[model samples]
Target: MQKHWWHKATVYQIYPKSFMDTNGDGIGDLKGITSKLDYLQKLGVMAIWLSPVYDSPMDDNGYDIANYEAIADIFGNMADMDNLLTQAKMRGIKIIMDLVVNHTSDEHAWFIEAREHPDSSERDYYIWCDQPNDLESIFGGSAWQYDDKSDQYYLHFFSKKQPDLNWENANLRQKIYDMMNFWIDKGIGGFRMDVIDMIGKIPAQHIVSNGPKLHAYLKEMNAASFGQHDLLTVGQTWGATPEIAKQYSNPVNHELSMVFQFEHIGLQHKPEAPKWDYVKELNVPALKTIFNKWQTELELGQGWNSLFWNNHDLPRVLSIWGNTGKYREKSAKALAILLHLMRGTPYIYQGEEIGMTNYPFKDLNELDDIESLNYAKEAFTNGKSMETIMDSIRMIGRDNARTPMQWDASQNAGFSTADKTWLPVNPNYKDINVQAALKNSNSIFYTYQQLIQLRKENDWLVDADFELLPTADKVFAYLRKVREERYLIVVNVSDQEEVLEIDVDKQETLISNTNESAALANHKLQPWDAFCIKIL
Candidate 1:
């Protein structure tokens, strides 16, 4: 097993557009992130996985890149970014930029040249055909769209504006490598590759994920750019399995440091159903099954996994898995224990440390996600009422995690002084803001801080083997061990008592959700309570 700085590190993800609005322009900028470096240092995170701050038309909120080398005006300029990288490095915090190379904005120069000039060499930079195929965009509708300028159909796996890049071309691959080196040379730590699994896509065979030539492309990219640097890299691959994850992150693969797999996320959705459609059940057993597989399969030093419960693209786990009412704080701490105690590098999304939940969206007009809006447009015309659609949107919309950071209880949650923000605040900001969390000694923020510190000081957490312990009735129990020393983690998701068969009557309590002196009073786990016990 090869050791690295990332193996013992905790990462915090920042959706820059919603993190802080410095100039009161209703959008968070790089300077906003720069001002929060000390706050992050206090949180004990080793790195920041910042969402895209690159030049874009905002069609998909910065995911669609207009220029690879340029910074978006909304997120400040090149100097602001340079200063941010310098300041973050000063605090010993690495900045990991979001690598959105899976697709470029239709407004990108290459796409424009390919669209306007049919005979140009850039025409091969994208996939085009005279005939459209049955491939459907993950965003909706057909993958192929007819372009009048080129008189050919171009494939876009996402929105019509986000055209997929032709990774099979040597020139295109080289261009991406050069662009990566451009950032890497600028003192950036690494990349969070967006939709990286779709790079080796074979559209003709109707395969758009983990294609035959995926490994070859990754190996090539590693040698050309990332291999020269010891950066902390992770791939965003939603279709990954245990075996596939091992193949991508295994040290021998020379590919990635880790991969974000979403088997546990889709547990709430019905079989083969779209994102907007979901079932209102916890399914704790299914969740345990996923955590077990990833923990045991990705061995101590072989392959690695990226542990997370919320992100820019996904809804807040607090709203789904944890209670947001009377037991909100308890539930938040419980989830932290379950996720942070596992054998992987944990990523805490912005506002997650303070226990932020889904926004209380009251109207259909409040929804802002492009995919959610696309689904609504079709459903409205198909006879589904607005209220019915809004219910689904409330649960699955991406904006759930995109709301402005609740810095304080002041107007706009102290995120922006403007009359309005790009997205609505969660409305409960006054009660759940960072100001309130930091003031309280036993807040969820401190729970996250403690968990991060634990990762750094404990070798057993990083090098130990994981085993799922037998549990009954909605409680998850697992043991992390490296010989005689063991840590038993037990978390109850439901609002009822769950009894554990094992005894912890005399063991030392490392941490617990309630700060409970006796978390296992009579072997009965309280509702939404989680604790770690050290036994020898």
Candidate 2:
């Protein structure tokens, strides 16, 4: 495997609209993000991943880009972005922007011109047909949207307002490359490609994702733009396996630095089911199996993985997987140890360090995500009860993670002084906010700091071979080995205590959620406990 600068670095994701607001506009802007650089630096952050702040219609919360080169008014102007880039660089932090080239807002100039004249040069920039196909959107409904002006239908994998770009068009591809180069030249570190798997759409056969020419397109993208810069890239590929992921993420492929796979993250339900579906409860053994498969497969294939438990589009990790109700602190730290100690680039979502959890959504009226709202409407039309649909929404809604950052216990959680916020703040801010966590030595925030610091100081975490350990039920164990140095990681992903039967003459606890002593008593572990033990 080849070495990279980001191999041991930690990346942090920020949802701009909910991060912080300095103008009292109820929406977070670039200025607000700049103001929090010190806060992030103190947490041992190395890289910052900002959600889309480009010109957008906000129909999909900044994913629907209207202009590729311009900053949106809601997120401040080009000056604010430049200042942020310069300040972050001065603080030794790299910035990774969201690249949403798979689709563009219907109001984009390219789409507007494409709809105006069928014989115009811009007409081929987007996928269009006279008759619509039977394809369905990822969000819901038919993927084809009828444009009365051009008397044709355009393809969209996400929403009718966002039309899929035609990668087959040489001119369109060149334009995208130019836009990417613009950002790269401006000193931005890299990109987090949004739904990039859908870019190579096989609309002729109604195959919307993982098209045949995906690799070809990515290779061309790398050579034309990304290859010139020392940057980080992670593609959000939903239906990718280790075999398929290797083709895109292996350094030899020269496509991307890493790829985000949802196989391990979506163990709670069937992969094909919608997010709103409430299916099987989270199984510990199943979760361990998936992670082990990815870790082993990717290592063998020389492909890198982007490790994350929560992001802008997913529910809080503590609420979904950990014991948020009773063992919030213990389980949150255990999860942090399990993820950060793995062999990959670890990403920390904003507010995740302090054990932030899912919002207590009461009704659909309070929801803000387009997918959640659309699913609720479809469920109602399909004869599902409102209570049942709302129940599902509470479990997996994207809005749950988009709530304002819990900075303090002040009004609006210190995200803004405004009377209102873009999204409701998680009401647990009083106890889970950064203000409280920073004052406590044993807080989840401190646990993450220690884990990140350890990753920087220890080579075993980044350069060791990983192996799963056979242990008792509800206990997930693994070993990270580098020659003579071997570290044993034991995690109890349950509410009950577990005892490990491993025999060892001497062991030292390097890190633990409960801050337990270095010595162990018969290899016993507590409920929601996690420890990285060094064996001698």
Candidate 3:
């Protein structure tokens, strides 16, 4: 449980494809990210967890990386990337690149070599079989795709164009490590590993995650690259539980800085079918239960956790949880308080600080997420109505977060000057954008800024022991205690007002989204009202 510099720092996620576009090409490039350094620094973010900008075919929107060492032309060349790192570092901000090593684009040299020449050493770089198993891809139909040239089926957990790498091969593993070290040697901040848990797979036995050599491979990876430097290496593991999280992130394990667990976010989805089949209402009790479990268990086991609600693959929290219609300001601020005050480093997705909401598309053609499109097609084949498919897409689709970041009310939300962007700009961008939020002193963006400021100003907020204040499901109330200092955080997560009888009636209020919050006991909290009080 040693404190790293990142523990006290707030990280911002920039899906570069949608963040900003300096060129008229309509895709966000490295230069665009470099231009946002002042914006990020002014927002009090000390580090940037940048999404993939590597050489990609854009099949999975940069998830399908064609080259690890090269930068994609759509996102500018290697020079632009180096400049971004330099500019960001000059502003006292670190850039954490997305490390998508689980799979590589079929167009990659290794995959091409493997497919073209079966006798070559690169033939084992990717998982392949003469008789493929019955494993449907996480995105859609079948995980295995038969290639004409190879005369064998290759494994891909996602799109057919993206083939899963064979971690069983030491040569391939070292290739990944060497590529990672290439970035590290270039003086980049760190890596945010993509689906790192899925790296350890037993294809024949049908075991995709948490395989036998997962920890061993992780420890080996750690020693090979990031261990030598002060890097913030986070593993994206949808399968990680508190127990599994401890093993991946425990300081003694020498695996990762932390692991992104999906238990909380995945709660909204139906267990049998997730990311598409989702429950409409937010389960406050379930959410609180999951939150508290992660808070306590990670702390007790000396494991680190990554706190995030918004991401490239998840729906916006405001529209789903808050629906933030009349109370977008209050709800957004309330959610920010609930998350940023937790016992871990917080991630702020691009435009989330300004209270971005999901856009409801009218037609299927308007949507661009490959996962959603594939699922919709599959749902249609299963005889599901178009209405039901679109409903699910609007409810929990990945494109909801993939929308371009709203910068201004101008054309294309000021994300680009092109005739059309890669994705349509959310219509409500005029009312909700960075320009308007910054102009309004009481905007949700400012609230987020202050919460991040509070964390760095008081180190106790970073690693404080968390305990629920025993409130109703609609009310998220917890206490942060470290040394002799204690702080109470209370939030009315629901839209309707809720009153909670707590014993901290006379505590000193540190920060709140509400106006007339006199006493805690028998007080009727406003819709989405939240506060943190200095209890001791």
Candidate 4:
């Protein structure tokens, strides 16, 4: 395997809009992120993967890009971004911007011109057809929308306002490469490519994901822009298998440094309908199975995986998987220990360190995400009652992770001085705010700090081979081995205490969720308990 700085570094993701609000404008800006550099440095964050701060109309927040080169008015100007880059670099932290080339805002100049006329030179920059297809947008309704001016239908994988780019055109691909270099040349790190797999679409097959020309496009982009810089890059690809992930992340392929696969989390959703329409109970064995495959396959294939539990587009980890009521702290710590010890680079979403759970949304009116709103409307039209639809939204809505960062217990949760925030803060912020966590020595924040430091000091964590231990119940156990130095990891993933029996000796303790000790006693694992043992 090839060595890289990111392989040993912990990546922290910040949804800039929800991270902090500096000017009291009810929106978090780049300066807000700049203000928290000290906090991130203290937490041992090596790299920062910020959600899109580019110019946008806020349709899907900042995912819909209006201009690739300019900073959004809400996120401040170019100087603010430059200051953020300089400050972050001074603190030894690399900045990874979100590359959202999969689509551009309809308000963008290119899209605006493309819609001017069917024969317009810029028309080739986006996908258009005279006839609409059966393809459906990820949000809802048909993926194709009729533009009366052009007298043609345009393709959009997500919202209709976010028109998909025509990657088949060489000119458009070069334009994207140019935009990427523009950012990399500004002393910033790399990017977290959004829906990168969808860049290459098979128009004839009506397939919008992982198209045939995907690898060729990635290799071209790498050689043109990212190949010149020492940057950390990862691609978010849905419908990606281990075989596909290996192709994207293998160093020999000269593509992305890693890829974020959604297999493990996909287990929680049914096979049909919109993702939020139906929710399946968490299948522990199935989750373990998916994790095992990725760990072993990616390791042997010489590819890297991006480990994460929460992100801007996903619900909170503790709320979805871990127990947020009875064993909130315990489960949050256990999950951190379980993932951080594995053989991959772990990403910590903003506010996840202090154990932030999902926002308790009382009504759909409180939800502001475009996708959630669209899905809710679609469900209503399909005869689903408001209560039934809201239940699904609460489980998987993107708004769950977009609430303001709870800095303190003050008004607006210390995110802003405005009367109200862009999104409602989780009322539980009073108890889970960072100020309270820092005051408590045994808080989840400090536990995360310990975990990050452990990875930094230990070389085996990044290079070890992973082996899933056969467990009888809901306990997840694994061994990370780097030659003779072996570390055993065990986590009671359930809310109930279980009797765990393993065939290994009771070795020295390395880390534990509880302060009591990492020592195993009577082979009994308490609810939400986790410990890492060094096999002597």
**Candidate 2 Cα misplacement greater than 4 A, ranges:** 515-520
The sequence of per-residue lDDT tens digits that candidate 2 reaches over residues 319-380 is: 88888878899999999998888888899999999999988899988998999989988889
Candidate 3, 75-141: lDDT as tens digits: 9999998999999999999989999989999899998888778999988999888998899898888
Best by TM-score: 1
Best by lDDT: 1
For model 3, the stretches where C-alpha displacement exceeds 4 angstroms are: 505-507, 519-522
Residue pairs in clash, model 2: none
Root-mean-square deviation (CA) per prediction: 1.1, 1.5, 1.3, 1.4
What are the Cα lDDT values of the candidates? 0.89, 0.86, 0.88, 0.87
CA lDDT, candidate 1, residue 132: 78
TM-score of 3: 0.98
C-alpha lDDT of residue 328 in model 3? 90
The digit string of per-residue lDDT tens for model 4 on 456-522 reads 8888888789999988558899999988888999988888877677656646777888632422646
| Every model's TM-score | 0.98, 0.97, 0.98, 0.97
lDDT ranking, high to low: 1, 3, 4, 2
Alpha-carbon lDDT of model 2: 0.86
Q: After superposition, how far is residue 37 of candidate 2 from its true place, in Å?
A: 0.3
